[PDB]
From Swiss-Prot:
Species lineage: Bacteria, Pseudomonadati, Pseudomonadota, Gammaproteobacteria, Enterobacterales
Residue ranges annotated for the Helicase ATP-binding domain, each copy included: 268-413
Domain notes: The individual domains assume different positions in the enzyme, allowing the holoenzyme to regulate the methylase, endonuclease and translocation states. Deletion of the linkers between the domains prevents movement and thus restriction activity.
More info: Type I restriction and modification enzymes are complex, multifunctional systems which require ATP, S-adenosyl methionine and magnesium as cofactors and, in addition to their endonucleolytic and methylase activities, are potent DNA-dependent ATPases.
Reactions mediated catalytically: Endonucleolytic cleavage of DNA to give random double-stranded fragments with terminal 5'-phosphates, ATP is simultaneously hydrolyzed
Record region (Nuclease domain): 19-223
UniProt GO MF annotations: ATP binding; DNA binding; type I site-specific deoxyribonuclease activity
Superkingdom as given in the UniProt entry: Bacteria
Protein name: Type I restriction enzyme EcoR124I/EcoR124II endonuclease subunit
Keyword Cell inner membrane belongs to the record: no
Residue ranges of the region described as Motor 1 domain: 224-443
EC number: 3.1.21.3
Annotated stretches, region: Helicase domain: 700-826
Annotated stretches, region: Motor 2-helicase linker: 688-700
């Protein structure tokens, strides 16, 4: 009984009228009752408490006297000092209160029955109390809130508007908001960087087709058996205490894995490709969240003995290690050591084993008579890199007698890119579920890429477009790719443009950070050193120079594939080692840390580093092959690439930037100093088809300036220039304004102006054009200063020199105006107007 359906016919409208919020509520409520939600009238917390008493007493087969119930309420149910996070902890972890009654007996009081999900009572109430809302109670507790909006209303603006007491509502797990035509859900979390519209979600079928309109959503997501599985089994509450509600493709993959295990086991058809299967979830879509989740759920199968969750040590980071520490303590790190693996194996009242592919491979190599070999075993592999994985297969196939193995990847191995390895199909069998890039991009769950070769160094162009790889390896030296001029010019470009690319320009904007991925240890050395030196140079010249905080990490290697780097620092050549040494020292001074380069220190440096790049304590991380495949940083938006990336490694590295965040993060910038255009298209095309590139890759500067049609959608989009010109035709102020309808129009228009500028901020052509608005002239030392920093012709100079932009002041007159009109919310009709909330606040 899958909860993400293969098939669903659309409900028919009544109708039976359906404009008004109270129209939507009437039907929602009616529909929910048909589906077996008892409707109750509740007017007060007091009435809710009593209802909870009735429900929990029923659930738990026990009656409180009033003094106990008061005590239960004050100490567990509804502590005055609990907040949302505490209730979520209670729903997800501490849902049993071991209660001691007046007569001194001890009894487990469950808020939810998780084993017998359908035993839970579900009920609905309406808003008690100017806002229509329906709440679903589970055993009396409010866990879902549906916010209802007029058909007119732009869901996003409504979301923008809303997102103790009365204190029971601290239990909400899930929000749904709907204007009838559209319906999105999102988790109730206090974590503000999970709180933007980007994290709201549509319900869907297993082919990922959306289910948008409320009646269909009701009849699907809101089946008791669906809703309660979502709440209880398909929401994650992790170690940073973030509630994440799984998206449909995540649940669809997960349930399909579990059912596959069960039917295999029942068929006694273990230990072949047809016993398991694979999951093609595109890079960044939550493979690691989902696969881990599915391993945890798999432990609940009584007949499975042990569940291995296996990750690649390459993919580890701080959040992720924190998370595994709870299930397999000090056993999931970068080392070859198995001692910890083999100790977790011998724990009992235990079924989950998390480990790396390196470790599992070592263990099975060494190791011949493990009881686990004869047990009923599940393997879930999260994106394991292709070669470590291959030796592991040989032994696992050799050695486990009864297993069901599954893999998640965003970049499968097909016959075409096989060479070396077994295809993914051949290893795992059937594709159980797919959610591919064009899917994720249509759903706005992954960001597009803006990819440009920074072709601005003629001296070195011929190197930078070289295709033969023998030559490319031959050129990794100071004569060629690490010529100190090349390194300088590139590094200068990066210092000149970091703030522009990461949107730290018109600050106090927070903005983003960045990585620089390079071809070799030496490259990283040259770049680190050059950054250091070039920042000393600014620091004297200027002196309100605000330095970027740069760091680097690497060790030792040794297509498609990003080279695996060891965590055994003693493999490195003496000079590499000493440089890493001096960098760690500098890092130690700055952050008051105390790492070293012995293996334990390096591992800890690695771990602190991930944390600090995630939280932007570091501005630029320089890297050879590390943090390129698994590292999760939503506020990283720019990859600088001086590296020969191809195929799956290309897709992975670029994807470091692809995490959604908010309206401020429009796509990931990829700025390359070798020409990666062919490679980029070949890679995208390998993992889609011939059209896939037009969905993944952003449009040209000229297209955002002058207008185009999104072939995906086909939305015609203006035209920053069209926009700017409309603003001036329509709207030079303040008399331009001042009828309400004109205000509406301005808001819509200046909305687009804001979206367009924000997009354009990521184009060198634009940053260049903007800079030219100073200067002048003379000038004309600072004429020359500017030509040289934006790499601009005389020729080009004269061009740019009027394209015409609106004055800064004229803009801040629009701005505050704009803001003005927003604050006086709360003819003419205002339903469909979205304000650029995120972009403003920036
Ligand atoms: N259902 C969800 N709800 C909220 N946030 C999510 C959800 N799924 C993923 N995310 C967030 O998206 C980001 C990517 O998740 P994750 O790292 O598991 O993706 P991935 O596919 O493993 O990426 P990679 O391919 O780089 O390993 C994380 O910050 C994660 O918390
Ligand atoms: Mg991952």
């Amino acid at each position: 009984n899958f909860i993400v359906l293969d098939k669903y016919i659309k409900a028919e409208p009544t109708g039976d009228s359906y404009q008004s919020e109270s129209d939507l509520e009437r039907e929602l409520i009616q529909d929910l009752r048909n589906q077996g939600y008892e409707f109750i009238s509740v007017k007060s917390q007091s009435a809710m408490l009593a209802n909870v008493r009735e429900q929990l007493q029923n659930l738990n087969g026990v009656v409180f006297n009033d003094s106990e119930w008061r005590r239960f309420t004050e100490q567990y149910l509804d502590n005055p000092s609990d907040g949302i996070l505490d209730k979520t902890r209670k729903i997800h972890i501490d849902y049993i209160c071991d209660f001691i009654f007046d007569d001194e007996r001890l009894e487990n009081i469950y808020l939810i029955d998780k084993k017998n999900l359908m035993r839970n009572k579900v009920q609905i109430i309406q808003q008690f109390e100017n806002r229509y809302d329906v709440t679903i109670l589970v055993n009396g507790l409010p866990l879902v809130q549906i916010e209802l909006k007029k058909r007119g209303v732009a869901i996003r603006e409504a979301f923008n508007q809303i997102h103790s007491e009365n204190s029971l509502f601290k239990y909400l797990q899930l929000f749904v908001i709907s204007n009838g035509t559209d319906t999105r859900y999102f988790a109730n979390t206090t974590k503000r960087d999970k709180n933007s519209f980007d994290f709201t979600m549509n319900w869907a079928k297993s082919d990922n087709t959306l289910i948008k309109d409320l009646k269909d959503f009701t009849a699907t997501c809101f089946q008791k058996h669906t809703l309660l599985n979502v709440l209880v089994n398909y929401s994650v509450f992790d170690s940073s205490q973030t509630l994440l509600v799984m998206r449909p493709y995540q649940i669809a993959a997960t349930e399909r894995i579990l059912w596959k295990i069960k039917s295999s086991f029942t068929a006694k058809n273990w230990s072949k490709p047809e016993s398991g299967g694979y999951i093609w979830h595109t890079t960044g879509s939550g493979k690691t969240l989902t696969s881990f989740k599915a391993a945890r759920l798999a432990t609940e199968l009584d007949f499975i003995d042990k569940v291995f969750f296996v990750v690649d040590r390459k993919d580890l980071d701080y959040q992720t290690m924190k998370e595994y520490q709870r299930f397999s303590p000090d056993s999931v790190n970068g080392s070859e050591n198995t001692a910890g693996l083999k100790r977790n194996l011998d724990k009992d009242d235990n079924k989950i084993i998390v480990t790396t592919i390196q470790k599992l491979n070592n263990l099975m190599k060494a190791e011949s008579d493990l009881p686990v070999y004869n047990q009923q075993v599940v393997f879930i592999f999260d994106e394991c890199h292709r070669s470590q994985f291959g030796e592991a297969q040989k032994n696992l196939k050799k050695k486990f007698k009864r297993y069901y193995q599954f893999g998640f990847t965003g970049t499968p191995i097909f016959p075409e890119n096989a060479l070396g390895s077994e295809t993914t199909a051949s290893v795992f069998g059937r594709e159980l579920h797919s959610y591919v890039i064009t899917d994720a991009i249509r759903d706005e769950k992954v960001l597009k890429f803006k990819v440009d070769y920074n072709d601005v160094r003629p001296q070195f162009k011929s190197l930078e477009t070289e295709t033969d790889e023998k030559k490319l390896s031959a050129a990794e030296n100071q004569q060629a790719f690490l010529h100190p001029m090349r390194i300088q010019e590139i590094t200068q470009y990066i210092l000149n443009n970091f703030r522009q690319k990461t949107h730290r320009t018109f600050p106090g904007s927070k903005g983003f950070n960045a990585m620089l991925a390079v071809s070799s240890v030496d490259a990283a050395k040259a770049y680190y050193a050059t950054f250091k030196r070039l920042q000393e140079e600014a620091a004297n010249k200027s002196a309100t120079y605000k330095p970027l905080r740069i760091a680097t990490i690497f060790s030792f290697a040794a297509i498609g594939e990003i080279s695996d780097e060891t965590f055994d620092t003693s493999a490195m050549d003496s000079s590499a080692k000493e440089f890493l040494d001096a960098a760690i020292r500098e890092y130690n001074s700055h952050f008051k840390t105390n790492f070293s380069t012995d293996s334990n220190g390096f591992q800890n440096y690695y771990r602190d580093l991930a944390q600090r790049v995630k939280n932007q304590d570091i501005d630029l991380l320089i890297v050879v092959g590390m943090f390129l495949t698994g590292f999760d940083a939503p506020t990283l938006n720019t990859l600088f690439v001086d590296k020969n990336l191809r195929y799956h490694g290309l897709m992975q590295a670029f994807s470091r930037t692809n995490r959604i965040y908010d309206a401020t993060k429009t796509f990931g910038n990829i700025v390359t100093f070798r020409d990666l255009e062919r490679s980029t298209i070949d890679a995208i095309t390998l993992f889609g088809d011939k059209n896939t590139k037009n969905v993944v890759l952003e449009k040209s500067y000229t297209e955002y300036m002058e207008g185009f049609t999104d072939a995906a959608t086909g939305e015609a989009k203006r035209g920053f220039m069209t926009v700017v010109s409309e603003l001036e035709q329509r709207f030079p102020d303040p008399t331009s304004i001042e009828s309400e309808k004109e205000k509406k129009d301005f808001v819509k228009l200046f909305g687009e102006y804001l979206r367009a500028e924000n997009i354009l901020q990521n184009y060198d052509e634009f940053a260049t054009l903007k800079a030219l608005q100073q200067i002048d002239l003379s000038d004309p030392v600072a004429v020359e200063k500017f030509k040289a920093e934006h790499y601009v012709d005389d020729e080009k100079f004269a061009e740019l020199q009027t394209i015409r932009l609106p004055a800064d002041r004229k803009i801040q007159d629009y701005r505050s105006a704009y803001n003005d009109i927003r604050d006086w919310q709360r003819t003419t009709d205002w339903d469909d107007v979205v304000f650029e909330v995120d972009l403003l606040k920036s």
